[PDB]
Amino acid sequence: SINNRLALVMKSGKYTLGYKTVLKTIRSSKGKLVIIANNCPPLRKSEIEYYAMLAKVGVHHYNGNNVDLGTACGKYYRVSCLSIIDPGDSDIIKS
RNA sequence: UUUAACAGCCUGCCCACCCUGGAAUCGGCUCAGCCGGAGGUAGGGUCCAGCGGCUGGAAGAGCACCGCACGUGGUG
Numbered sequence: 114s115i116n117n118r119l120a121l122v123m124k125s126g127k128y129t130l131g132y133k134t135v136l137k138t139i140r141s142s143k144g145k146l147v148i149i150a151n152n153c154p155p156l157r158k159s160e161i162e163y164y165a166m167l168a169k170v171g172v173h174h175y176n177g178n179n180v181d182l183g184t185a186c187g188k189y190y191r192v193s194c195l196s197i198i199d200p201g202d203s204d205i206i207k208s
Numbered sequence: 209u210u211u212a213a214c215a216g217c218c219u220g221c222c223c224a225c226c227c228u229g230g231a232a233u234c235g236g237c238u239c240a241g242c243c244g245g246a247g248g249u250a251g252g253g254u255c256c257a258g259c260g261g262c263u264g265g266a267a268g269a270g271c272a273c274c275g276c277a278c279g280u281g282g283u284g
């Protein structure tokens with residue numbers, strides 16, 4: 114899994130959690146990798162992927178729901194999707 | 209010791225909704241709940257209810273009281 118690599122970003126890299134900020138980072142091209150939970154709304158999932166394809170940003174489908182993804186990020190709330198701005202330590206390379 | 213339908217304007221309950229923004233030292237919140245990265249708090253807006261407010265209707269009416277005549281005037 115990517116929980117170990119994702120944990121490193123939470124303390125050494127730059128990221129935005131949530132659907133509204135993820136679109137913002139894709140619009141400004143600050144996002145380098147987008148991670149989406151498996152229970153994300155199907156329409157929202159397609160919209161994010163279309164945005165990422167338009168901005169030439171890689172998309173990773175997380176193996177877990179928004180509850181699991183939020184826990185992986187070390188947060189006490191659900192996260193449907195997130196964007197990584199600064200990888201920090203070998204997250205965008207091996208994905 | 210009063211103020212109808214109706215007409216215009218204002219107000220904008222409890223909710224719902226929109227924009228900005230991005231939250232752990234978690235916070236907001238009800239009598240009770242409960243709500244928030246599926247975007248809270250906060251700031252600024254939109255909409256909805258009315259058996260709500262103002263004016264018109266409408267004081268010319270009604271009521272009370274005091275007169276003059278035996279209808280008519282005044283005050284509130």
Ligand SMILES: [K+]
Nearest residue numbers: 212213214259
């Ligand atoms: K009526």
Ligand SMILES: [Mg+2]
Nearest residue numbers: 250251252253
């Ligand atoms: Mg608000």
Ligand SMILES: [Mg+2]
Nearest residue numbers: 263264265266
């Ligand atoms: Mg009046």
Ligand SMILES: [Mg+2]
Nearest residue numbers: 267268269270
């Ligand atoms: Mg009168």
